[PDB]
């Protein structure tokens, strides 16, 4: 099928500090599955008939100085191109590639090539991996099930050579508690951490099928990180100045509304590039002994 | 010109007991008043050049048992009407009507008297009131002024008569911290009330353009709301419950990001029909002794 260009002008529902924008990314994905995989996700129902989400389970954006996430102001035009890759009946990935309109070589079509290994600064970067998934008992945001509807067309989607797995990436995630191997050479670990409380937000972080959002783990990973800064003495001010050049996300698992989850934050410093960190943050339901979400953000800052 | 029609399939980003469906109402705001007076809303600039922000001044939300807010799950079809209304060319008032999808009578046009004099249950109706503003200063979110792009068409825009002026609503709101007036008969004023401090959350509720995100009132505003329910010994279970069938807003401010706001909330029980409140919610800017929001909430629970 044909990938989908679209031209976007930024509203106030898909940008600033908060999680519009990973929000907006989330619509597209579902809009861009349903439009290649002949699916109607949003009201998606497995061959029993209840009701099927297609979770976010992997999520990468990718910028740099020239183009990130807080680069975007109401007003600006973008070019956003979409579409899915084969990963079988159960999962699915998505791609969204985002140029400013009018730049050079803004019509040119998905590259896997360059999305896995010759990235743009001034091009942002999203890979969404899905999986389709069910309710165990109604009510339980937990051991929820794999699954898929019927008629979902992953057949001749593009097929992903084995070199561009999100499946390697997310597995050693979850085995490693970063996307960047605590072994990477020009970085330090700073001594400073930080654990913090967070009750399931149930005015803020429930989605309309009684999940917790999606984009609720990006808010939940940068309380964390925001915890971790005031730590390190820096001020808010300079909070909302942080360029995030890459985050990776992995959603481990979901929780019930009246959960108790614990933030988690490190930090590593550059010694090589000034003001450059990595910051990785786990989310864990202590009762339940589940890691429910590993992040990596690769920040610059002053 | 051309109301809008829309067909939308519910979306992750636009429902849920979170701001999320505000959100969006908000974007189509934007959406329609470009559409329909000729000015690139999103990136606009005053006559000087300056960025002007549409500001949301006055926020209604009107469903019923039969279609509220709460309503709304993945995948549902909707069919949106959307216009706007001659306020002169500092501001404009923008409707929505929102219908399920195949339902008598969902093709009808805007109705100022449906919308003002004979609402359905079973329609949901929203009134954006919206302000053009510029800060007075840079980096100050205190006193906006008055604002209008170059090229601003109102002109042709069809008119409100005198009786539905959402001006004298907002006027009465601001002076009794209530949309229904304290002397309404079949209710009764529950003796507890809460204050909440709450500073600027600069993770969650900072727009693209460094302003409190309009969406964030409804926020700040369902955070007391839960406040003095929890003090009503009432369960966060019953929380999520909640039917919210009628809802007004007044953006009296926005705030700097290191502000703590003061959130007052107090609720009175009908004496007539059981579960029926109204819930008052004032939001303070103590440091600068200004109320920046008003909010009453028409509510149904068990
Ligand atoms: C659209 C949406 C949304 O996707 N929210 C959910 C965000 N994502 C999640 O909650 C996925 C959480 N992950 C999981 O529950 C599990 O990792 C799951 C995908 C079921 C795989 O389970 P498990 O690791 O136990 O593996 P098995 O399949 O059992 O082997 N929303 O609006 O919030
Ligand atoms: C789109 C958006 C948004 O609109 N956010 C802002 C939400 N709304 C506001 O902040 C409006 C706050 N209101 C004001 O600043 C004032 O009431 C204002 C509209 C300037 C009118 O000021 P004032 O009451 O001092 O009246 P004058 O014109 O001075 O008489 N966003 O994405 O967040």
Known sequence: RPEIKQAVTV?????????????????????????????????????????????????????????????????????????????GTESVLTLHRIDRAGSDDAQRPLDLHEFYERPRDGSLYVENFNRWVTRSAPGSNEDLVKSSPPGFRNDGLPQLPAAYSPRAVYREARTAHTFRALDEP??????????????????????????????????????????????????????????????????????????????????????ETPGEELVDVVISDRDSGRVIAVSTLHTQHD
Chains 1, 2 share one sequence.
């Open 11 to 87: 509203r106030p529902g898909m940008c600033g500090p908060g999680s519009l924008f990973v929000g907006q990314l989330g619509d597209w994905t579902w809009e861009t599955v349903s439009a290649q995989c002949d699916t109607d996700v949003f009201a998606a129902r497995d061959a029993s008939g209840n009701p099927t989400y297609l979770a976010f389970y992997y999520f990468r954006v990718r910028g740099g100085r020239e183009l990130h996430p807080g680069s975007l102001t109401f007003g600006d035009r973008l070019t956003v191109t979409s579409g899915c890759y084969d990963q």
């Open 186 to 271: 020009g970085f330090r670990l700073l001594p400073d951490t930080v654990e913090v409380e967070h009750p399931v937000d149930i005015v803020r972080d429930v989605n309309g099928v009684g999940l917790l959002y999606f984009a609720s783990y990006f808010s939940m990973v940068d309380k964390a990180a925001l915890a971790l800064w005031r730590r390190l003495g820096r001020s808010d001010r300079a909070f909302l100045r942080r360029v995030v050049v890459d985050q990776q996300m992995c959603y481990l698992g979901n929780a019930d509304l009246d959960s108790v989850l614990t933030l988690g934050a490190r930090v590593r410093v550059s010694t």
